[PDB]
Design a protein around this nucleic acid. Structure first.
Ligand SMILES: [Mg+2]
Length: 99
RNA sequence: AUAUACCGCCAUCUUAACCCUGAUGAAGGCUACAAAGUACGUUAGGUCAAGGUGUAGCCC
């Protein structure tokens, strides 16, 4: 339901995403990502689609950022101090290629 | 006579945290082609034979 305002219409029962809105949303998201990378924030890419795990991990390594394409263990973020250490620094921005 | 006086020696028995979910109810938390889970005393005991320190008994 919450995706309806972003849908241009249904073509023979297939939803078409309105790309005029995608352009503005992508503009905002890319601007935010660039500003966070300028501030030396930790950026974590996340995606559980196994078809693109290798691509996303390579891209994360290439841009000097972080990836988590594997099974997401309970408490990675909310229990990070127990899992990583008391002084671990969490990501400042998380990007989902697949939500 | 007493270790049913102690000591020695033998033997008997006794000796968590964090994080999530449920409307932050009682409560619950697994799937790998992965979906919240991760970290000494005790004994009416034996032994007075390879050992001791005491205590009492009778003493026409
Ligand atoms: Mg005895």
């Amino acid at each position: 339901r919450f995706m309806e305002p972003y849908i241009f219409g249904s073509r023979l029962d297939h939803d078409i995403i309105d790309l005029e809105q995608t352009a503005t949303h992508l503009q905002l998201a890319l601007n935010f990502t660039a500003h966070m990378a300028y501030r030396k924030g930790i950026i974590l890419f996340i995606s559980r689609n196994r078809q693109f795990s290798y691509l996303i991990e390579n891209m994360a390594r290439d841009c000097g950022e972080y990836a988590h394409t594997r099974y997401f263990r309970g408490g990675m973020l909310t229990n990070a101090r127990l899992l990583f250490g008391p002084t671990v620094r969490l990501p400042d921005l998380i990007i989902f290629l697949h939500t």
